[PDB]
Amino acid sequence: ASSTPQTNVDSMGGGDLTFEDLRDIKDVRDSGGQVAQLMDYKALLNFGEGCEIHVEGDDETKQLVDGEPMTLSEWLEDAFPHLDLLVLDLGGDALWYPYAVGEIQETITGEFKEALPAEPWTLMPESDAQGKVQAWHQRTKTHGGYQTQTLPADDLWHIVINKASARDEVGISEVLRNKDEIQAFKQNEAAINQAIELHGFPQRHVKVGKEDGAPVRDNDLRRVRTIFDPRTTDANTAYFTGQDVDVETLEAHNFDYSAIHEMDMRNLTTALGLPLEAGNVGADGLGSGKPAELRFALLKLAIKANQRSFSVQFVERVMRPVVRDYSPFDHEADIRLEINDPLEDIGEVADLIQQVGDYMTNEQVAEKLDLPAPEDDEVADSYRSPADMEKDEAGV
Amino acid sequence: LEDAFPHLDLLVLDLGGDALWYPYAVGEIQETITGEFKEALPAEPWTLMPESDAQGKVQAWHQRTKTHGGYQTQTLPADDLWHIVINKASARDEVGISEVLRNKDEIQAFKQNEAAINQAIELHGFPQRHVKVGKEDGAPVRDNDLRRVRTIFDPRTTDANTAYFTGQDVDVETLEAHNFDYSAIHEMDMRNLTTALGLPLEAGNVGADGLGSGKPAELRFALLKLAIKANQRSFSVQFVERVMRPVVRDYSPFDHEADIRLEINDPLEDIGEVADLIQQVGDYMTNEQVAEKLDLPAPEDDEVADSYRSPADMEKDEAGV
Amino acid sequence: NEAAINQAIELHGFPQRHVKVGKEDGAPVRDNDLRRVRTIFDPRTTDANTAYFTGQDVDVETLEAHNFDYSAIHEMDMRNLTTALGLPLEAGNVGADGLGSGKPAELRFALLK
Amino acid sequence: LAIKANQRSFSVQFVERVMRPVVRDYSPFDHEADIRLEINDPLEDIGEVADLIQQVGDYMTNEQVAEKLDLPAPEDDEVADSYRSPADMEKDEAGV
Amino acid sequence: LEDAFPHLDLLVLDLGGDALWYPYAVGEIQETITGEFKEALPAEPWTLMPESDAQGKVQAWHQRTKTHGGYQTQTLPADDLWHIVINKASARDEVGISEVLRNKDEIQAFKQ
C-alpha cells in the first residue's frame, strides 16, 4: 500500500473557530447556574471517579533506576503522583473546549518535574490539508492590554475527545455543538423570572368614583394612594368607604411555568446527552425496571467511550513521550490507564464474588473488589480462597 | 492482530458510527516507513462518493474537498482502498442508504415542531397584560396619551407588590396564557422520531403507560438486541473479509485464509444472568466456557480449562493428596 | 392518518392570535390600516413579557387550541397496523390493562411463537 | 462524585502546601514520605461495610478489613497480613 | 504529624469551608518562644487579596483591615504564607473561583 496519506481532509488555513469562540465557552464556564452545573456534572461523571496506571507483564520491566529497582508502573506513578486531578482538569477542559493542551516542565537539571495543562481559551491550533496540527497560536491579556505568540507542535501536547472524524486533530466543543439550546434555556429562564415578577403574584387595583359619575384627577388619586398604601398596610388592616370606591383584584394569572422549566431542562439535557435526572426532573414508570436500566446502559456506554478515547490519547501523546524523554525504561512498552466507572456498585461485585468465586482467581477477585492481589504466587493465582488456604495450613 | 490493532474498540465505534450515519464507512491501508503495517486509516465519508461497473461493484472512489477557502477534486482506484455498509438496499447492493436520507421528512418535521413549540410557548405560554384606556362609547384616546399611560404601567419598572390607583375609565386586563398540550406534542414527536430510527421510546427520555412490566416490557428490549446482534455480525464479517484478511496477507508471516474471528460486546448483557447461569448449570460448562461467558482468561493448564468441574473444586480436593 | 395528524397539529394543536380592530356598529377599518396594526402586534417581534396599551376599540382574541384525541387516533392506527402485520400490540409502542399480565399476556407470545 | 473529587483536591494541596514544608523546615523526619491524608465520607453507610465484611472477608486481609471498618490493624504482623479472622486463630489456639 | 496537628478535623473543616465560600483559604506558620514549630494558623479570608505576574503566579499578598473606626493596610511576600484553592478556571489557576461570586445573581434573585 503506502506510508503516507492519499485522501484529503476538507480544510486548510482555517475558515475554523476563533479566540472569540474560545472566550464564549470560557464565559459560559464562569457564568455559573444550572448550565455550568450540567457541564460540571458531565465532567464529574466522565473523570471524577479517578484512575489507575498499569503496564502489561510489568515484572519484566524491573530495572535499577538509581541503584534500586523499580517497575515502569512505579516510575509512571512517580511521574504522575496525583493523576486523578490531572485527568479531571484535562478531561473537563476537553468537554468544555474542543481540545485540551499542555507543556512538560523540568527541574533546573533538566530531569522531569511535571506535566502542565495550558489555558485552553488562550490557544488555538493551526493545521495542514494532510489533516495535522503544525503550530499553536496564543493570544493573551496582560496589564489590561494584549500580547500574542506562536509555538511549534513539538514540545506541546494535546488531546481531543470530541473529534469530527477518526482522523481529526481539532474536534468540536459540545457547547458550540448546542449553542442555540444553551441560549434558549437562559432566555426562557429570564422569561420565567420576569413573568413570575409580573404575573406570579396578585396585585391591587383601587378604582375611585362612580360609573358615569364625577371626574377623578391625579392630585385626588395621590391622596387615595396614601390611604391604601401597600408600604404601610398590614395583615389585619380594614377599610371604610362610601359606595363609590372599589378595591379590585388583579388575580395571579396562573400559568404552568413548572412544565415550561421541565420542557427546557428536558430539551437541554437530551441535547447535551445528559441523563434527565442531572437536571433533577422526574417521570413516572421510567424510574424502575428495563426502562431505567437502558438509560443507565446508554449513560455508561457514553462514559466508557469518552474514558477510553481520553486514555489512549494520554498514553500515546503524554505518557509514552514522558518515558521516551526522561526514563531508563522502554517507551514502546504496553502502558495502560483505566478510568473508573462512576456508577459501579460494590454490592453487585460482592454478590458476584459469592456466586462465581469458584471460577475466578484470588487476583481476579481482588481486582474486581478494587484491592491489590496477594503477595504469594499460588495465593494470588489459585481459585480456592486465601482464608481456605490458611485454615487448611493450620490443620493439615 | 492485537499488535496490528491495539485500540480496536475506538476504531469499531468510529466505523460503526460512520456506517450508521452515512451510507458507508471507507478507508485506506497505512504503513510505517519501513513498510510494515500501521493502521487501517478511515477517510471522511461526506467527502467521498463511489463509482461502479456494470455488475454494480465499486471500482473507484471520487473525492471533493475544501482547502484555503477554495476547492480540490480527485479520483482514486478502489484497489488499495476498503469500505463497509450496515444498511444495504439489497443483497446485491454495495453502497447502501443513510437512515438520515431515508427518514429525511421525519427529521425535518421533528425540527419544525420543536421550533413551532419554542415560538408558541413564548406567545401563548406566558400571560400578557392589556391595559384598556377610556370609556366604551366615551372620549377618544390617541398615541401621545397611550405613551403617558405606558410610562406609568411599564413592566420594566413594575414589581410583585406594586399597586394601581385609577378612575373608573381604565381597565388593567390580562391575556391569560392560552394553555395547550405541548407535553403530548413532545411525546408524539419523540414517538415519531424514535420509532422511525428503530429505537425504543424509553431511549428518548419519554415514558409509556402499562408497558413497564413483564414480557410486555421485555419485547422492546428483545427487538433492540435482535437489531444490535444483526448489525454487529454484519460489521464483523465485513471488517474481517475486507480489512483484517488483507492486512494479514500483506504484512503477517501467517496464512490469511485461516478463520479470524471478531466479536463486539453486548450493551444489554446481564452479569447477574451469567452468575445465576453459572450457579444453575455450570455443572455442564467447561472452565473455558465459564471464563468466555464471565469475561475472563481461561485456566493456564489444558485439562483445567477443558474440564467441567470448578478449578476451586479441583484445588480444594488436591489439597488432601 | 399520519399526514392528517401532521397538518391538524399545525392548524389546531397550537393556539392562534386574532386582533380585532374598530368598534361594533362603528367606523370601518381597511387593509392599509390593518398593515399598521400588524406592524405593532407582530408575533415575530413580540416577547414573553410584552405588554399592550389601547383605547377601548381594539381587541386581542385567541383561537384556543381545539383539543382532539390524536393520541387515541394513533392508538387505533397502530392497533390496526400491528394486527394487519400479525404482530402483537406491544410491537407498535402501545399497551393496555387486562392484556398486561397472566394468560392474557401469554397468548400473544404463544401466537407469535 | 463531587465530594470525592473535592476531598482528593484538598488532601493533595494540604500535604504539598502545608504538611511537607512544615516537616522539611522544622522536623527531624524526612519530608518526601508518602503521607496518606484522607477525609471521611458522610454518605457512606457502616451497614454496607458490615454486609461487605460478611460477604467477601474470606478474600480480604485483616489490615484491609481494619481500614474498611475504620479501626487499627492487629498488633501481630501475620495476624494483620492474613485473610481469615483473628477470632478463628484464637478459637483454634484454644482448641489446641 | 499528630503532635503538629492534633485538632486537624477543625482546621480541615475551616479551610475547606473557607475555600468554598471565598476563592481560597490562607494561613501563617507560627513558632514557639524557643523557635521550634507551634502551629499553622488560618487568616481572615476576606482581608487578604493576591497580586500576580505574567506567568500567572502570586508574588505578593495584600491585606486591608479595620481598627478603631479607621483602616490599616500592609503587603507581604508570597513565601511565608500558605494558600489552598478548591475551584479553578484552569490547571494553572492560583487565584480560584468563589461559588458565592459565581452565582451572585441567583443568590440576589432568591433573596428578592
Cell numbers of A113, please?
518535574
Q: Is A203 in the C-facing interface, judged by CB distances under 8 Å? A: no
Residue given cell 385609577 in the structure block: B166
Nearest CB among C9, C53, C64 relative to B150 is that of C53
Q: Is D51 in the A-facing interface, judged by CB distances under 8 Å? A: yes
Closest CA to B96 of B228, B198, B199, B238: B238
Q: CA D60: distance to chain centroid?
A: 13
Contact B167, A207 (CB under 8 A): yes
Separation between Cα atoms, residue A251 and residue A91, nearest integer Å = 51
Q: Sort strands A203-208 and B163-167 into parallel, antiparallel or unpaired.
A: parallel
**A262 CA to chain D: closest CA distance, Å?**
24
Contact D63, D73 (CB under 8 A): yes
Contact B291, A359 (CB under 8 A): yes
SS (HEC) of B255-292:
CCCCCCCCCCCCCCCCHHHHHHHHHHHHHHCCHHHHHH
Angle between helical axes of A289-314 and A33-47 (0-180°, round to 10): 70
User: Which residues in chain C touch residue A195, judged by CB atoms under 8 angstroms apart?
Assistant: 48-49
Angle between helical axes of A179-199 and B104-124 (0-180°, round to 10): 20
Separation between Cα atoms, residue A288 and residue B53, nearest integer Å = 54
- Interface contacts A/C by beta carbons within 8 Å: 8
Supply the DSSP string of chain E, one letter for each residue.
-TTT-TTHHHHHHHHHHHHHHSS-EEEEEEE-SSSSEEEEEE--TTTEEEEE-TTS-EEEEEEEEEETTEEEEEEEETTTSEEE-SS-SSTT-SS---HHHHTHHHHHHHH-
Coil, helix or strand for A359?
helix
Task: Name the experimental technique.
Answer: cryo-EM
D interface test, pick of E2, E18, E29, E58 with most D CB neighbours within 10 Å:
E29
DSSP single-letter state for residue A319: I
Supply the DSSP string of C41-90, one letter for each residue.
S-TTS--TT--EEEETTEEEEEE------HHHHHHHHHHHHHHHHT--GG
Closest CA to B120 of D79, A212, C11: C11
Q: Is A200 in the B-facing interface, judged by CB distances under 8 Å? A: yes
Contact A95, A273 (CB under 8 A): no
To one decimal, the resolution in angstroms is 2.4
Supply the DSSP string of B164-176, one letter for each residue.
EEEETTEEEEEE-
DSSP single-letter state for residue C11: I
Angle at B315 between CA B313 and CA B320, to 5 degrees: 105
Residue given cell 495542514 in the structure block: A128
Residue-wise burial string across A267-285, b where 16 or more C-beta atoms lie within 10 A, e elsewhere: bbbbbbebbbbbbebeeeb
Cell numbers of B198, please?
428503530
Contact B279, A313 (CB under 8 A): no
DSSP single-letter state for residue A133: E
Burial class (CB in 10 A: 0-12, 13-18, 19+), A359: buried
Chains B and D touch (3+ CB pairs under 8 A): no
User: Which residues in chain E touch residue D41, judged by CB atoms under 8 angstroms apart?
Assistant: none
Closest CA to D37 of D64, D17, D53: D17
Interface contact A366-D88, CB threshold 8 A: no
Cell numbers of A206, please?
383601587
Separation between Cα atoms, residue A198 and residue C47, nearest integer Å = 14
User: How many Cα atoms sit within 13 Å of D38 on the Cβ side?
Assistant: 7
Closest CA to B218 of D82, D54, D79, C95: C95
Contact A230, B158 (CB under 8 A): no
Burial class (CB in 10 A: 0-12, 13-18, 19+), E91: buried
B residues 89..148 contacting A (CB < 8 A): 114, 117-118, 121-122, 125-127, 129
**D14 CA to chain E: closest CA distance, Å?**
7
Cell numbers of A344, please?
459501579
**What torsion, rounded to 10 degrees, do the Cα atoms B119, B122, B128, B132 define?**
-20
Separation between Cα atoms, residue A182 and residue A189, nearest integer Å = 11
A146: nearest CA partner in chain E: E54
**B150 CA to chain C: closest CA distance, Å?**
7
Separation between Cα atoms, residue E112 and residue E101, nearest integer Å = 17
User: How many Cα atoms sit within 13 Å of D8 on the Cβ side?
Assistant: 17
Paired residues of E62 in beta bridges = E49, E75
Chains B and A touch (3+ CB pairs under 8 A): yes
Residue given cell 437489531 in the structure block: B227
List all residues 6 or more positions away from D22 whose beta carbon is below 8 Å from its beta carbon.
Answer: E4, E29, E37, E40
Separation between Cα atoms, residue A119 and residue E95, nearest integer Å = 14
Separation between Cα atoms, residue A251 and residue A201, nearest integer Å = 8
Q: Is D8 in the E-facing interface, judged by CB distances under 8 Å? A: no
Contact B166, A217 (CB under 8 A): no
Q: Name the H helices within B53-154.
A: 99-102, 104-124, 143-152
Residues in chain C: 113
SS (HEC) of A264-306:
HHHHHHHHCCCCHHHHCCCCCCCCCHHHHHHHHHHHHHHHHHH
